[PDB]
């Protein structure tokens, strides 16, 4: 049994539905990958801040949680190939003239937080994605910098209270599954399953289903 670790707070990638079950793109993907690898799985929810150390300590066996493949994270864990192509990061604000060099909210331990910390903007970090949106809505922050695919439905749901500002920024290597560095054989099973979904078009279909007809595909 493979314990699949996810954040459960990052729609539409992953979330806990009203039944208390893991749901989202990654629920469907993860289940189909395990089916194709011949593995049975069990889903484990873990907060983003500790999702890497808790994989390393053996609380679960994979991270499938919208995590970009990066060299920095490759220092402690190993990634499969990407299962979504690299997509942009974007700024979101309550007005068009928001000061993007002011206070910018980003989720802790993300490439977006890293980009803002290196920038001239003042970074404020929040534990969860929803807290970054709340910080903008309530005026504690000038804007939020986050994954564009996370922000698109949020902007559409806002009834005009939230909007994209500035330009998109490409960050990170595409989303991939994380595993312990001593787990090469399991990682290889997942890699072989991902490749099979790329080859037969089922991954592209899953991506468009969850991210829209215009989503980047393979
Ligand atoms: N893909 C970005 C954002 C992840 C956001 C998780 N709620 C990263 O890996 O840092
Ligand atoms: Na590594």
Q: How far is ligand 2, taken at its centre, from the CA of residue 154, in Å?
A: 33
What is the C-alpha separation between 120 and 64, in angstroms, rounded? 32
The residue whose CA has the least distance to atom 7 of ligand 1 is 10
The residue whose CA has the least distance to atom 6 of ligand 1 is 66
Nearest to 104 by CA among 78, 130, 133, 79: 133
Q: How was this structure determined?
A: X-ray
Which ligand sits nearest to residue 110's alpha carbon? Answer: 1
| Residue 23 β-bridge partners | 15
Domain 88-171: which CATH class? alpha beta
26 lines ligand 1 (CB under 6 A): no
Which ligand sits nearest to residue 182's alpha carbon? Answer: 2
Q: How far is ligand 2, taken at its centre, from the CA of residue 153, in Å?
A: 33
Q: Are 143 and 105 in contact (CB under 8 A)?
A: yes
Tell me the HSE value of 2 on the side-chain side, using a 13 A CA sphere.
Answer: 25
Atom of ligand 1 nearest to the CA of 112: 10
46 lines ligand 1 (CB under 6 A): no
What is the C-alpha separation between 26 and 81, in angstroms, rounded? 15
Q: Are 153 and 146 in contact (CB under 8 A)?
A: no
Sheet holding 175-179, edge to edge: 41-45, 2-6, 62-63, 175-179, 78-84
The topology under which CATH files domain 1-87+172-218 is: D-Maltodextrin-Binding Protein; domain 2 (3.40.190)
Which ligand sits nearest to residue 184's alpha carbon? Answer: 2
One DSSP character per residue, the chain reads -EEEEE-SEETTTEEE-TTS-EESHHHHHHHHHHHHHT--EEEEE--GGGHHHHHHTTS-SEE-SSPBP-TTGGGTSEEEEEEE---EEEEEESSTT--TTSEEEEETTSHHHHHHHHSSSEEEEESSHHHHHHHHHTTSSSEEEEEHHHHHHHHHHTTTSSEEEEEEEE-SS-EEEEE-TT-HHHHHHHHHHHHHHHHSSHHHHHHHHHH-TTS---
111 lines ligand 1 (CB under 6 A): yes
Domain ranges of the chain: 1-87+172-218, 88-171
Mutation pick for ligand 1 pocket among 74, 85, 110 (CB with most ligand atoms within 8 Å): 110
């Amino acid at each position: 049994t493979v314990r699949m670790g996810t954040e459960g707070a990052y729609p539409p990638y992953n979330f806990i539905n009203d039944a208390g079950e893991v749901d989202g793109f990654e629920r469907e993907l993860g289940d189909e990958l395990c089916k194709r690898a011949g593995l049975t799985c069990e889903w484990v929810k873990n907060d983003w801040d500790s999702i890497i150390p808790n994989l390393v300590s053996g609380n679960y066996d994979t991270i499938i949680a919208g995590m970009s493949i990066t060299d920095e994270r490759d220092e402690v864990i190993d990634f499969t190939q990407n299962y979504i192509p690299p997509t942009a990061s974007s700024y979101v604000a309550t007005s068009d003239g928001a000061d993007l060099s002011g206070i910018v909210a980003a989720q802790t331990a993300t490439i977006q937080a890293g980009y803002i910390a290196e920038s001239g903007a003042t970074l404020v970090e929040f534990a969860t994605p929803e807290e970054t949106i709340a910080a903008v809505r309530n005026g504690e922050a000038d804007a939020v910098f986050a994954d564009r695919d996370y922000l698109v439905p949020i902007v559409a749901e806002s009834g005009g209270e939230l909007m994209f500002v500035g330009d998109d920024v490409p960050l990170g290597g595409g989303v991939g599954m994380g595993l312990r560095e001593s787990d090469g054989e399991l990682r290889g099973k997942f890699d072989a399953a991902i490749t099979s979904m790329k080859e037969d078009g089922t991954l592209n279909t899953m991506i468009k289903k969850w991210f829209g007809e215009d989503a980047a595909v393979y």
